[PDB]
Design a protein around this nucleic acid. Structure first.
Length: 144
DNA sequence: AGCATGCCTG
DNA sequence: CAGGCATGCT
């Protein structure tokens, strides 16, 4: 297969539970069924850029509504795991907290007025990827 | 140019 | 999510 099928995406979204900034080097490894090339690679990578934005958009929101002043998972889980195909790995539940803690810190400190202030947060989150489970390489995984 | 990042759009 | 565009390095 040379093209990313709609399952490849359903799959990619799941991986996001373990990795926010996967290296293209690693992405390939988890898609042995795909013969990459400038395009599909660019595309797969774009997917994650997209997964990240939605994610941070959600983080900054919850963080802000909180400052002023859970089910937020329904949101995140709906977005990346629509049919609850797998169980949300605990690491993810911690990455989330880490992320929310950072935004809350930044916002509450008004340090959110500076341009590209989210950047700091990003560098921090980028070191939190975890190794994506081995069975994600399994041809049989894509099925189910 | 030719491929990668990133922001931001619809 | 895919398109566009501005950008930065080669």
């Amino acid at each position: 297969s040379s093209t990313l099928t709609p399952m490849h995406l359903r799959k990619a979204k799941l991986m996001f539970f373990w990795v926010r900034y996967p290296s293209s080097a690693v992405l390939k490894m988890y898609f042995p069924d795909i013969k990459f090339n400038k395009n599909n690679t660019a595309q797969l990578v774009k997917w994650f850029s997209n997964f990240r934005e939605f994610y941070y958009i959600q983080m900054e929101k919850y963080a802000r509504q909180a400052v002023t002043e859970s089910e937020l998972y329904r949101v995140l889980n709906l977005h990346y795991n629509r049919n609850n195909h797998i169980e949300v790995p605990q690491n993810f539940r911690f990455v989330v907290e880490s992320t929310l803690r950072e935004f809350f810190r930044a916002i509450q400190g008004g340090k959110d007025t500076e341009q590209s202030w989210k950047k700091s947060i990003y560098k921090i989150i980028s070191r939190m990827d975890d190794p994506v489970p081995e069975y994600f390489k399994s041809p049989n995984f894509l099925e189910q």
